[PDB]
Design a protein around this ligand. Structure first.
Ligand SMILES: *C(=O)CCCC[C@@H]1SC[C@@H]2NC(=O)N[C@@H]21
Ligand SMILES: *C(=O)CCCC[C@@H]1SC[C@@H]2NC(=O)N[C@@H]21
Lengths: 683, 683
């Protein structure tokens, strides 16, 4: 009963379309991604060998004592979150993972988990994220792995109790995660210290990421000054971080600001490794990374050349070529870069339904005025499409700016940017301005994320909440102040394990109860879907998003040894219950799949009958047209008296009543062409 | 391997259409024929009981001593030969045979075999005629059967040797035939005596049928006078016939001529039974039959009221009603007639593709000027449709009159009418008049039936052949005079049995070798078809001519006990070899049928290549357009010299020759937009 669920999925996708929401109506390309040649044998030695040999402090001293620029690949997580709405599957990553393991041994790390990959992998792709992590950990053994962990937000959207995040880092380090980049939205310091403690006690390398916004080189803006970042970095180094990081999530770091900030961090902490992360939204990413690498940055984040650009990271080939021959040489050969970007061009062609290039064709300097991050940009375009706002995204960006100013000049990264984007979609859908919605603040019903933020369930912003808005929206809802994670009670995780073993099965693991603690309803619907259709992980992307075509024999190997040569021969028409039939040739023998179509129902309405059991139910003895009614609705009549007269083709009849009674209502109007045995009078 | 051939037939009819030629593009009606209620038990006693009890002479004395008019039903043979091109199957006859056996016990006989039913049952319907005869002989035991046998023509179209017709009557009497109506086309007397001897020595009742033509009441026409019929009847009574018959095959008997001829035959032979057969083409059939029954006729031929009329027999209900209360009472109840005609209205609705009423909506008095018989009328319309003359049938009838006059005023019945109709289609297809084709008689190529008739292989006409035409068409072909059947050698029938057992199987019976003696190639193609698709006899007519529809469960019971509930679920698209696939649900399990489509082939042509193995094969290195040729076809050139120049999108190339040689031909013309690697010069 394994190929039957797969054929049910394939027929359901053929007849009804894909169960994924599709924002751009397009098909996957017929061209396959070209995987290059990989030398057979064990891969080279990398930085994970020195990590497992001498710990995180020796890893930090090795990355600090490396002559030249080090790179981190973000193609597996942040490139397709910025460009393809986080929709790239584990199949296309596993096809290129041995090439990366053989040829990119000199990388610092590789971000391939965390962010929005958790929620999208369970929600839209029907995959387990721990399964992707384990598969790529077997495939790439020589390069350290890196995950993007929020403060007390783990991989969710709100603050969690401490035991859940500690257990989350414990199990993620158990599965294979090496480097943990911990950041917070509002730069709220105890949430950062909590996330750093949870990441450090699990045994992993800690990368304390400071969220950057504004401009430190512009003295006109004084809220997030250079001294603000210097004090934040001083306290984060005082908590025992191993690598400091600057997360510029919108792409706002300019070369002068880069030189100023990295030189301040280098002459304040002379032996601490600096990592810079930026997006190339404004079009100045490679220039900013060259400014950082000359100012004293150690690791910078890149992506493959076909998977970089618009809202993504800077390009790997441009960073390799722009440092060739310099003292900052990365000594990576460019031909391996060419083959890797060749693969990702072929693989990006498969995801044309979620692609950024259907709307945005080049960069945009207006990110200097709306400050939207890139992953949020593509996921926000999808979310605005799925709520009817799919043709008003410029107004969503304008209300984005308005909602940033209205909520008190927040630092927008994931959670806070999700709050500002929810408020922007609310202000677009209800036509409200800034002052127009602050005047009606005590009347309107803001969404759960905005009201939950104004309560303070994610933390406290810099300079405090907007207190007139917080007084007008929150009437008497509880304002839990201080730290949200030090107030909420710990979830009994063995109770949740006991709650989940009696619903799905007995292969429920701690990874599953962490998936259900982070997302209860998404894990429930994911488990129901994978009960119905089974492991759709090992399908290719054209099969997953499009199904097969007629008379084209395709090969599916679900598990080890179990191979299936499947043809799709015909699709019938609809049955009595609105169901179609699909005919397959599975392993050479004919099989049949019955799938419910989803559009051919809910089309019926007509006039009711005249029920014969009651003599006071006067109906039409013959069809035609009501030409005159002789009764007043409310009086009573005798039997034999005329009530209504009807006419048909050369025929006219007068309706008589069979017995007495009070005329309740005249059910028929004037000149209503009714059928036979249809009710004209209730009596 | 029995349901597979049936499903192959059903899928072949679904995808490709019916293998029958269809003259009128229409579908069988969704209404089923309403079979009435039949009382359970043994049927009444009829005339076959007195036949089997006292022989043909006692049968003749019983039909001669019956007070009142006797009827013969022609609905099973002559009605659908006149109206539906002989296409009614054994299924629809078997559905009403027990009703006839229970309710029409007072019939004289029932014509249900012979005529064109043999050739059409093997050729277009894929049935054995002996199978129909045996099935209806089990179903109707109380009524004598009647067959229409030609002279020395048996059930064919030319004269046969004596042993074949004697064996034919032997086996037909063995199978269940009781009454044999023997007639000849030219009223050639020794062929009539041969057919009467073959029918009488087998042990059956002999009905000597005189073919009627012209008008005995009109003294202006003197060729077929009343004395001619009187002398013919005198010699046919002198040969020992049991029942005399007048076959008016075109419908030319008028009431005065009927009274004159039947009164002459009654006062010449006072104790011999007279049978009259007519068609209702002119619209005076019931009046003529009432005139015959009052003049002294004993049996008249009728048909069911929904299966009578236009070119068919007179109506049974009109004959029953017009003799009610008279001394000529038939004592048949009219309600049984109503139910029988109700069945045949429902069953005639199934044969809408072969129906007379698509062209002819009422009778026609022009049969007084063209003299076409009714069965020939419908079969001739089919034959003119299958030879491209389907829209020129009025010209076929005009050339019919011309070919009657041109061939010497023949008596037109089956063979002779087939000769005149072949000549009429020849004169329509070649635009010839009468004298225009007799002037070119020595030049043209008349068909095999006309030339074979002018040789005299069917017999000698009254007054001799047209001797200028017989001299001009026949140059030196052998004119076998006298009797054709007393000249030809007898066929070795055991040799033909030995020839047929080593081709099809070992269930080859004498009925099969008579079928192959009468029609060799039709029996061969019929045996190949029934080897491929099996016994298609037990299908209903909508299934046979139309196939099934999608998602409509139909029941087929091929043989005793073996029942099949078949659904048809889907039909795919075409394969590589142009074949479609049909999906069935046979007995509840899914089956697949692969049928060759017949239209999606024979579409390819383009320019040939330039073959690389020869250096003297100069072809186009790039596509484009020939703009100038610099060579003269015939001279020889050196290598490096320009030959042709070609242009494409912003590109122009000059063709050089690789070596020397003589330019044979310039293969390309001016401004021929050719492809790449396409030949421009042979050298
Ligand atoms: C669900 O659609 C997955 C994307 C949801 C929003 C994600 S979470 C990370 C990015 N930051 C943000 O505010 N939106 C993006
Ligand atoms: C074949 O199509 C069966 C009909 C062929 C002609 C038949 S034979 C009897 C009728 N008489 C005649 O001349 N044509 C009809």
């Amino acid at each position: 009963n394994r190929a039957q669920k797969l054929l049910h999925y394939l027929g359901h996708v053929m007849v009804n379309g894909p169960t994924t929401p599709i924002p751009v109506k397009a098909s996957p390309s017929p061209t396959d991604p070209v995987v290059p040649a990989v030398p057979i044998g064990p891969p080279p030695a990398g930085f994970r060998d020195i990590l497992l040999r001498e710990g995180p402090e020796g890893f930090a001293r090795a990355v600090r004592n490396h002559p030249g620029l080090l790179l981190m690949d973000t193609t597996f997580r942040d490139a397709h979150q910025s460009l393809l709405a986080t929709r790239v599957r584990t199949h296309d990553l596993k096809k290129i993972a041995p090439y990366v393991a053989h040829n990119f041994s000199k990388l610092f790390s590789m971000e391939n988990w965390g962010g929005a990959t958790f929620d999208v992998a369970m929600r839209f792709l029907y995959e387990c994220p721990w399964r992707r992590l384990q598969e790529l950990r077997e495939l790439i053994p020589n390069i350290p792995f890196q995950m993007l962990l929020r403060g007390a937000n783990a991989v969710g959207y709100t603050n969690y109790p401490d035991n859940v995040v500690f257990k989350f880092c414990e199990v993620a380090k158990e599965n294979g995660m090496d480097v943990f980049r911990v950041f917070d939205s509002l730069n709220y310091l105890p949430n950062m210290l909590l996330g750093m403690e949870a990441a450090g006690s699990a045994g992993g390398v800690v990368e304390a990421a400071i969220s950057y916004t504004g401009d430190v080189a512009d003295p006109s803006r004084t809220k997030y000054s250079l001294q603000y970042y210097m004090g934040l970095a001083e306290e984060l180094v005082r908590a025992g971080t191993h690598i400091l990081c600057i997360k510029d999530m919108a792409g706002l770091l300019k070369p002068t600001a880069c030189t100023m900030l990295v030189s301040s961090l280098r002459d304040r902490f002379p032996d601490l490794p600096l990592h810079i992360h930026t997006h190339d939204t404004s079009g100045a990413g490679v220039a900013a990374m060259l400014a950082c690498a000359q100012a004293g940055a150690d690791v910078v984040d890149v992506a493959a050349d076909s998977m970089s650009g618009m809202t993504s990271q800077p390009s790997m080939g441009a960073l390799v070529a722009c440092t060739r021959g310099t003292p900052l040489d990365t000594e990576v050969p460019m031909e391996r870069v060419f083959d890797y970007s060749e693969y990702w061009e072929g693989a990006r062609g498969l995801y044309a339904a979620f692609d950024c290039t259907a709307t945005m064709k080049s960069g945009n300097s207006d990110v200097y005025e709306n400050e939207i991050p890139g992953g949020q940009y593509t996921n926000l375009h999808f979310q605005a499409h799925s709520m009817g706002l799919g043709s008003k995204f410029k107004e969503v960006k304008k209300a984005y700016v308005e909602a940033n100013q209205m909520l008190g000049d927040l630092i927008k990264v994931t959670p806070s940017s999700k709050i500002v984007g929810d408020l922007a979609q609310f202000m677009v859908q209800n036509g409200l301005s800034r002052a127009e919605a602050e005047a009606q603040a005590e009347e309107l019903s803001f969404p759960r994320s905005v009201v939950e933020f104004l309560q303070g369930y994610i933390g406290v912003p810099h300079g405090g909440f907007p207190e007139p808005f917080r007084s007008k929206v929150l009437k008497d809802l509880p304002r839990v102040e201080g730290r949200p994670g030090a107030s909420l009670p710990p979830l009994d995780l063995q109770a949740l394990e006991k709650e989940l073993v009696d619903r799905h099965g007995e292969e429920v693991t701690p990874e599953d109860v962490l998936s259900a603690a982070m997302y209860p309803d998404v894990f429930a619907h994911f488990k129901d879907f994978t009960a119905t259709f089974g492991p759709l992980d090992s399908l290719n992307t054209r099969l997953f998003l499009q199904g097969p075509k007629i008379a084209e024999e395709f090969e599916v190997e679900l598990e080890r040894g179990k191979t299936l040569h499947i043809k799709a021969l015909a699709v019938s028409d609809l049955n009595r219950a609105g169901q179609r039939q699909v005919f397959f040739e599975l392993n050479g023998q004919l099989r049949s799949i019955l799938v419910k179509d989803t559009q051919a129902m809910k089309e019926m309405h007509f006039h009711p009958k005249a029920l014969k059991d009651v003599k006071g139910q006067i109906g039409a003895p013959m069809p035609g047209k009501v030409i005159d009614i002789k009764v007043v609705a409310g009086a009573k009549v005798a039997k034999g008296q005329p009530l209504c007269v009807l006419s048909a083709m050369k025929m006219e009849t007068v309706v008589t009543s069979p017995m007495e009674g009070t005329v309740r209502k005249v059910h028929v109007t004037k000149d209503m062409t009714l059928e036979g045995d249809d009710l004209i009078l209730e009596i």
